[PDB]
């Protein structure tokens, strides 16, 4: 609905740095590199091609929304989320600290205060341990 649609859009915007309405191969590599990824031009093209329906070389919102809306198999969704947690959890200690959430949020271009980040940790931190564990990430991610 309008909400999840708008969520997906907001996400789209993390990618479309220029706000031209499309994610080019360069914008994809930018966001990826931010998040500790280092794809080669080749990979980036293949990646953009996988979802470029109109063969126009770039990925627009409805091509993204289409990707983002595809039915992910349960066992697959779980896997997708584990992989996502692993992007936040840089030290790989199975817990997402405020330091890590700050890095990710900042690399993604997102602008928040140390208080806001701490808030995000706070809201997601059900077991009040100062950090976000896997089940907390999942509880928050769904």
């Amino acid at each position: 609905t309008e909400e999840q649609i708008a969520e997906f859009k907001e996400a789209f915007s993390l990618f479309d740095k220029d706000g031209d309405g499309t994610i080019t191969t360069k914008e994809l590599g930018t966001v990826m590199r931010s998040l500790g990824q280092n794809p080669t031009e080749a990979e980036l093209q293949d990646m953009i091609n996988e979802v470029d329906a109109d063969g126009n070389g770039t990925i627009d919102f409805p091509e993204f929304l289409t990707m983002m809306a595809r039915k992910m198999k349960d066992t697959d969704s779980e896997e997708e989320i584990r992989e996502a947690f692993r992007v936040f959890d840089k030290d790989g200690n199975g817990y997402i600290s405020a330091a890590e959430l700050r890095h990710v949020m900042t690399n993604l271009g997102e602008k928040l205060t140390d208080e806001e980040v701490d808030e995000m940790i706070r809201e997601a931190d059900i077991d009040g341990d100062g950090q976000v564990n896997y089940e907390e990430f999942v509880q928050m991610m769904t």
């Binding site: 969520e7 907001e10 996400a11 993390l14 990824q37 949020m105 809201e123 997601a124 928050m140 991610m141």
Partner: peptide, 19 residues
């Protein structure tokens, strides 16, 4: 949590694409 959702989607968008 809208900051979480939004961000999680983006990180997920990369995973999907990485296939």
């Amino acid at each position: 949590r809208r900051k979480w959702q939004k961000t999680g989607h983006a990180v997920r968008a990369i995973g999907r694409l990485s296939s």
